[PDB]
Design a protein around this ligand. Structure first.
Ligand code: ATP
Ligand code: MG
Lengths: 430, 36
């Protein structure tokens, strides 16, 4: 009847989801007593306490499970447990993908295509979790939706080898390497900075990012037999965000050498015939698969999207509850920074593969997330556009009177003497 | 600028690492992490 700070028993029948929506700011602690439960393919160890905060997700019962939960923002009669009838589609896909990893010369390079909240990211997470689960494969997870923070901050597209288990507690899947000892083995991602809020703000820049990611991805696959033998799992932005003719999907298929397509739509959805007609001559129809509506996949508003973007920025510098990190705050002079800004439809009408210089003012830089390239301060825009990303920094304060800035770094030490790119992303209170 | 405390923000300290370059990342083997 009223939220408690005590533990409560929960029996999830086999094949059912415990659907969680952590609307409130409070934490949920879960401890499994017996059975098999999974958060997007990641099994929760028995007796180990798991902590969750501000995210929507299902705890799936592979086997009938008895667990204890502690959360003051939920009561025993406010719990949502519903049977799932869609997992069969996921397993069937996984075991066919797995058959390719064992028998074919190289692993499958799969694209997941579909509409807004069709279950694209949920499928990608489960396929990656399962790839690692049975015969230990290291697939490359490729995120092409910059609004979705996975292993990094929001301005990015990324490629990350799923070399060990994901963090079941995190909406971001897990985190990148740290300087010391951690409970989980963290990830080593390749990040390309788009920096703008939406794909439509540029497109040519978005497509250059894909071109650049595609290149390094090929180089890694050439040198890494284990990642080459496992495949790629490519997650794309919501289909509506891309052009009518789907020309951006041709660029992704070409650049990332895609050979399998998974389409998340309805049985009467025109998407099915559209995709078959365009990508069928290139991939072969046998290599295009239709996945119906996945059970439990819930709609996501822009307020929750912004909540995740905020969480991922703090997680970048400070880590998670179970893994506390020490970022470093420095005072910098106006003279010590070379910041560039990408071309965009708002500021430039068009949106071209071009960077413009940024003048150091509190209106331009306060609370801004900045991408640090590998390029030298003196490097020309052509070199900067093509330069890899070292990391991100947060500009907390900009003082006009004194001509100083306060910069938060993920790494303790000096401010890297490198060319930088201003992102559209902001974060208040370091 | 002088809004709060510089420099290390919050025993056994640890920080986030910088990312690898294209060449270093391509040449990287996740078994470097995996063990242990
Ligand atoms: N069975 C389930 N029960 C409850 N919540 C679920 C279930 N499956 C998925 N969700 C939730 O549904 C939401 C949307 O799913 P998902 O992110 O996979 O969709 P999407 O296709 O990637 O969307 P987008 O096009 O915006 O990228 C997520 O918050 C996810 O945790
Ligand atoms: Mg998505």
């Amino acid at each position: 009847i009223t939220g408690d700070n005590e533990w409560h028993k929960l029996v999830i029948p086999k094949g059912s989801d415990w659907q969680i929506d952590l609307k409130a700011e409070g934490k949920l602690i879960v401890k499994v007593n017996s059975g098999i439960v999974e958060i997007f393919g990641t099994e929760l160890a028995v007796d180990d306490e798991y902590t969750f905060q501000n995210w929507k997700f299902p705890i799936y019962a592979v086997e009938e499970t008895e667990l204890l939960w502690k959360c003051p923002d939920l009561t025993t009669n406010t719990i949502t447990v519903k049977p799932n009838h869609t997992m069969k589609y996921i397993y069937n896909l996984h075991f066919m993908l797995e058959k390719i990893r064992m028998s074919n010369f190289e692993g499958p390079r799969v694209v997941i295509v579909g509409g807004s909240q069709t279950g694209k990211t949920s499928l990608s997470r489960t396929l990656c979790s399962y790839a690692l689960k049975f015969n230990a494969y290291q697939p490359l997870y490729i995120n092409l939706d910059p609004q979705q923070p996975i292993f990094t901050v929001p301005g990015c597209i990324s490629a990350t080898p799923i070399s060990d288990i994901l963090d079941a507690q995190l909406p971001t899947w897990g985190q990148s390497l740290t300087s010391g000892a951690t409970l989980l083995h963290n990830k080593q991602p390749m990040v390309k900075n788009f920096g703008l809020e939406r794909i439509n703000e540029n497109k040519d820049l978005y497509l250059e990012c894909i071109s650049q990611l595609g290149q390094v991805v090929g180089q890694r696959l050439h040198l890494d037999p284990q990642v080459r033998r496992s495949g790629c799992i490519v997650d794309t932005p919501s289909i509506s965000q891309l052009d009518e003719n789907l020309a951006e999907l041709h660029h992704i298929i070409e650049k990332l050498n895609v050979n399998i397509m998974l389409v998340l739509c309805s049985e009467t959805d025109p998407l099915w015939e559209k995709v078959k007609k365009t990508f069928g001559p290139e991939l072969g129809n046998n290599n295009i698969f239709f996945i119906p509506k996945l059970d439990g996949v819930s709609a996501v508003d822009d307020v929750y999207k912004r909540s995740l973007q905020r969480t991922s920025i703090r997680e970048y510098f400070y880590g998670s509850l179970d893994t506390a990190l020490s970022p470093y705050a420095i005072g910098v002079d106006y003279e010590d920074l070379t910041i560039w800004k990408p071309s965009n439809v708002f500021d430039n009408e068009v949106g071209r593969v071009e960077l413009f210089p940024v003048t150091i003012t509190p209106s331009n830089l306060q609370h801004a997330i900045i991408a640090i390239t590998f390029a030298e301060r003196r490097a020309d825009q052509a070199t900067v556009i093509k330069s890899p990303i070292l990391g991100f920094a947060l500009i907390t304060e900009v003082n006009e009177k004194r001509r100083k800035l306060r910069v938060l770094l993920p790494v303790p030490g000096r401010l890297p003497s490198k060319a930088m790119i201003l992102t559209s992303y902001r974060y208040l209170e370091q | 600028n002088t809004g709060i405390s510089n420099s290390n923000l919050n025993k056994n300290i640890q920080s986030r690492n910088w990312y690898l370059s294209d060449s270093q990342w391509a040449a990287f083997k996740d078994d470097e992490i995996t063990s242990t």
